[PDB]
UniProtKB/Swiss-Prot annotation:
Subunit structure: Interacts with mRNA-capping enzyme nsP1. Interacts (via C-terminus) with host G3BP1; this interaction inhibits the formation of host stress granules on viral mRNAs and the nsp3-G3BP1 complexes bind viral RNAs and probably orchestrate the assembly of viral replication complexes. Interacts (via C-terminus) with host G3BP2; this interaction inhibits the formation of host stress granules on viral mRNAs and the nsp3-G3BP2 complexes bind viral RNAs and probably orchestrate the assembly of viral replication complexes. Interacts (via C-terminus) with host NAP1L1.
Source species: Chikungunya virus (strain S27-African prototype)
Residue ranges of domain Macro in the record: 4-163
Name the record gives this protein: Non-structural protein 3
Binding annotation for ADP-D-ribose: D13, N27, G35, G115, V116, Y117
Topology class, membrane: Peripheral membrane protein
Record comment regarding domains: In the N-terminus, the macro domain displays a mono-ADP-ribosylhydrolase activity. The central part called, the alphavirus unique domain (AUD) has a zinc-binding function. The C-terminus region, also called hypervariable domain (HVD), is mainly disordered and binds several host proteins. This intrinsically disordered domain contains 2 SH3 domain-binding sites and 2 FGDF motifs necessary and sufficient for the formation of nsP3/G3BP complexes.
Subcellular location: Host cytoplasmic vesicle membrane
Higher taxonomy: Viruses, Riboviria, Orthornavirae, Kitrinoviricota, Alsuviricetes
Signal sequence range: none
Functional description taken from the UniProt entry: Seems to be essential for minus-strand RNAs and subgenomic 26S mRNAs synthesis. Displays mono-ADP-ribosylhydrolase activity. ADP-ribosylation is a post-translational modification that controls various processes of the host cell and the virus probably needs to revert it for optimal viral replication. Binds proteins of G3BP family and sequesters them into the viral RNA replication complexes thereby inhibiting the formation of host stress granules on viral mRNAs.
PTM comment, free text: Phosphorylated by host on serines and threonines.
């Protein structure tokens, strides 16, 4: 575990993270995809061997000794708000199980279902709150990655609010 488990946020490509493992915002089919998933495919392509997994689940595949946790959030274009919210919560609970199983002291994590799976809605708060619900009982240092300047400020404010 980390000596004083923390949350932090950085605005940069998660493929350049400084953590002991990475969470991919994966598709269910283990395809290269777009956005975070394509960056992860370019950096750790070996981790996409048998990475397909259903919505609401996470599947870890090692790239050398570096763990890539493929977490599949719902596409809100296809799910109802209610069923999508349940699958998004579930994907983050499966990430917390994997992070714990791996025994890492730190993890790089994107906000699931906030990009092309958002169904055209702002889901910063919804996705971040499910991230906290899952990860608060873990003792890994969590570093959240984002690309937008306004999102960086809002994520940082939300972390600081809990102290
Ligand atoms: Cl960058
Ligand atoms: Cl997404
Ligand atoms: Cl972002």
């Amino acid at each position: 575990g980390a000596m004083a488990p923390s949350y932090r946020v950085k605005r940069m490509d998660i493929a350049k993270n400084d953590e002991e493992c990475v969470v991919n915002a994966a598709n269910p089919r283990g395809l290269p995809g777009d956005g975070v998933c394509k960056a992860v495919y370019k950096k750790w392509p070996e981790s996409f061997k048998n990475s397909a997994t259903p919505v609401g689940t996470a599947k870890t595949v090692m790239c050398g000794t570096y763990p890539v946790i493929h977490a599949v959030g719902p596409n809100f274009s296809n799910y109802t708000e209610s069923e999508g919210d349940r699958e998004l919560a579930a994907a983050y609970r499966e990430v917390a199980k994997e992070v714990t199983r791996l025994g890492v002291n730190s993890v790089a994590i994107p906000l699931l279902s906030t990009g092309v799976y958002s169904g055209g809605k702002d889901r910063l708060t919804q996705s971040l709150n499910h991230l906290f619900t899952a990860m608060d009982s873990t003792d890994a240092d969590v570093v959240i990655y984002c690309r937008d300047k306004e999102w960086e400020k809002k994520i940082s404010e939300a972390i600081q609010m809990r102290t």
